[PDB]
Amino acid sequence: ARVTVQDAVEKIGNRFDLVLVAARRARQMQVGGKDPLVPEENDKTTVIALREIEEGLINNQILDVRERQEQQEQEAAEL
């Protein structure tokens, strides 16, 4: 995360997909106003996203499922 991203690369399996997923999560945390799943210790959103990815708590499928659930809750509340 800070010095080496090898664990995140192993978790995802491709450096380019890792960059894309981490950028999506970091933008969710930064502008989207979400909350981190790991204890943020004076870290930027990019490093927090990388640490979440290397911990198994964030990947593309998880982001898709969370997005669909949030959309369903939003449309149920808009009723």
Contact residues for other proteins (CB under 8 A)? 2-6, 8-9, 14-20, 22-23, 26-27, 30-31, 42-47, 50
Min dist CB 59 to other proteins, Å, is 15
Closest CA to 45 of 55, 36, 54: 36
Residue number with CB closer to other proteins (33 or 76): 33
**CB distance 38 to 51 below 8 Å:** yes
Residue number with CB closer to other proteins (38 or 47): 47
**CB distance 20 to 64 below 8 Å:** no
